[PDB]
Design a protein around this ligand. Sequence first.
Ligand SMILES: Nc1cccc(CCc2ccc3cc[nH]c3c2)n1
Length: 377
Amino acid sequence: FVEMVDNLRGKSGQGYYVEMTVGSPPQTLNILVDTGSSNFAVGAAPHPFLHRYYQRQLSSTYRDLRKGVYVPYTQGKWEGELGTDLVSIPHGPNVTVRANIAAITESDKFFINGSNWEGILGLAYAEIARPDDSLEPFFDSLVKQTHVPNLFSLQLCGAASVGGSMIIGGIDHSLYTGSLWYTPIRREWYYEVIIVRVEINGQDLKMDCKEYNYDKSIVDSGTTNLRLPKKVFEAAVKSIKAASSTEKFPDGFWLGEQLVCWQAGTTPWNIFPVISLYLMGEVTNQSFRITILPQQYLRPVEDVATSQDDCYKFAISQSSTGTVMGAVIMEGFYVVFDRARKRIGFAVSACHVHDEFRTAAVEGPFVTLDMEDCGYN
Ligand SMILES: Nc1cccc(CCc2ccc3cc[nH]c3c2)n1
């Protein structure tokens, strides 16, 4: 798996991408790694933001499926034409697979001006595939057509430029310390999990756990932030504000409507509480917890033109679609998407930013009853 170490690249806020090749002869593209969606979709036309795009005309192995797809977002979208073609990962397993590809022919607020990726690799399951669950995701084709074990793992670092590793088909023990703890995948659509308890600092929010998972909690490498359902975010924030009354900040800040700023090197790791999420464990009445630092939910904004300071954004925010454990969470940890056993494994990352005060942790077992009542139906 040393071929796969350090195979991911990126920039803050702009996601992590992996080099892939498509068609014959191979066309190299940088492809965003997205555990929050299930389509392999690539730029197929000379949009001005794009360094590179898929040229189907150059590929002997391309096959048209004669259907389009239309994928809405909030004031954003992409749209494309379906086909299949031969796909490889240069710094991944030593295989070539015929995959579905959405050739993106029109988009809105999808591609990022200034980024170095040109497509997206949806790594979640068929159920949330578009246009319907009959379009087989890349990873399902990969596993079905080769002897690659049905799992992958991600170490997202972010040291500006960020880096990491996507280990396809296995686990690399050099990427973590201590033990892996596993939480069941509740349903195979998103990588859905159940949060059973939340502690800001050690002290707990004391709210119906069912709310922590209203209507979803998912693990998503394509989201930057820890996102919390409105009611839990409300209480979430309420406690973070009090945890940190030491120094005042505006109301807009907590809603991600204003950046916060201190001068160079001018925050001493302390005014902010840790956050521990207790996840459902593999055994009845057993949970474990993962613990992150504010040097994870407080993220530098890469480059603000109207300032010269350490202007961090607040990486917690609200949702009508549920909890989202994005890069804020995953950058603390090595995360194992153990598809074969329907579980997600968490361990302390060998690359997470720490010091000799506080430190990201994965700990268990804890005793938690009624962990199923935490899931929404
Ligand atoms: N998982 C997820 C949620 C919302 C949208 C997407 C599409 C892929 C994507 C677009 C833009 C950015 C910026 C940072 N990460 C992404 C991922 N996927």
